[PDB]
Amino acid sequence: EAQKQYWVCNSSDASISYTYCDKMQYPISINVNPCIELKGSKGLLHIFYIPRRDLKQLYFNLYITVNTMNLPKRKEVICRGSDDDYSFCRALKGETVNTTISFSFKGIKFSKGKYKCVVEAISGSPEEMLFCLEFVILHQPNSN
Ligand SMILES: CCCCCCCCCCC[C@@H](O)CC(=O)N[C@H]1[C@H](OC[C@H]2O[C@H](OP(=O)(O)O)[C@H](NC(=O)C[C@H](O)CCCCCCCCCCC)[C@@H](OC(=O)C[C@H](O)CCCCCCCCCCC)[C@@H]2O)O[C@H](CO)[C@@H](OP(=O)(O)O)[C@@H]1OC(=O)C[C@H](O)CCCCCCCCCCC
Ligand SMILES: *[C@@H]1O[C@H](CO)[C@@H](O)[C@H](O)[C@H]1NC(C)=O
Numbered sequence: 001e002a003q004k005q006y007w008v009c010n011s012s013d014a015s016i017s018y019t020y021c022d023k024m025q026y027p028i029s030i031n032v033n034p035c036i037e038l039k040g041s042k043g044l045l046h047i048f049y050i051p052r053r054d055l056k057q058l059y060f061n062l063y064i065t066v067n068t069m070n071l072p073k074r075k076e077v078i079c080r081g082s083d084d085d086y087s088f089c090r091a092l093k094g095e096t097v098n099t100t101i102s103f104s105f106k107g108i109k110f111s112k113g114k115y116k117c118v119v120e121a122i123s124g125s126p127e128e129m130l131f132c133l134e135f136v137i138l139h140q141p142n143s144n
């Protein structure tokens with residue numbers, strides 16, 4: 001069984017897919033509306049997920065790669081303290097997450113080639129990996 005590839009969406013300037021990295025865990029459904037443009041766009045992220053850890057204190061380690069050039073790690077805490085928190089933050093092992101989240105993507109200019117972002121989802125203190133996803137964002141070869 002060859003490793004399965006997941007497509008999220010194509011925009012006018014990007015083609016977005018991902019695969020599961022590290023240990024294969026519970027699956028995740030990820031949808032983006034409208035599809036992100038590398039040159040910048042905003043929209044809504046829909047997530048359908050049955051988690052195997054509690055989403056409490058969820059953060060991402062982001063490893064971004066720009067045409068094979070690795071950038072230094074980034075951290076972005078998602079679930080922080082008390083409220084101003086997404087409702088899914090209070091989700092527990094086994095409780096369906098079925099939410100939509102707003103996003104704004106500023107965008108890169110002069111974009112070309114291929115980008116990668118590996119998303120290490122860590123949550124549930126005691127802190128263990130929730131999921132790992134490696135996104136591949138192709139720049140459409142026929143668009144700037
Ligand atoms: C990764 C591809 C997956 C498919 C797309 C999913 C949609 C999410 C994309 C959103 C990312 C952008 O917000 C980041 C961005 O553009 N950053 C700019 C930055 O801009 C200012 C801020 O803009 C918004 O805030 P305000 O409107 O309040 O000002 C950003 N905020 C939001 O958009 C709102 C939320 O924060 C969005 C988070 C949604 C994720 C939650 C998912 C929950 C899953 C749990 C359920 C189980 C704000 O963003 C932040 O503060 C941090 C935020 O968390 C972003 C990171 C989230 C993780 C993304 C990984 C995908 C997770 C999906 C897994 C399910 C911004 O700070 O402005 C600066 C300028 O000062 C600009 O930098 P410069 O370009 O240097 O100026 C930023 O631009 C960049 O960072 C681009 C870099 O150059 C990298 C180029 C790579 C090209 C794309 C490859 C992938 C990179 C993804 C991370 C950058
Ligand atoms: C999305 O873009 C990819 C890469 O350019 C391309 O191979 C694919 O055909 C596109 N998807 C569809 C079904 O248009």
Ligand SMILES: *[C@@H]1O[C@H](CO)[C@@H](O)[C@H](O)[C@H]1NC(C)=O
Nearest residue numbers: 046047048096097098099100
């Ligand atoms: C998830 O919520 C959506 C609305 O975003 C709803 O249409 C759908 O039925 C839900 N999925 C479930 C619980 O199967």
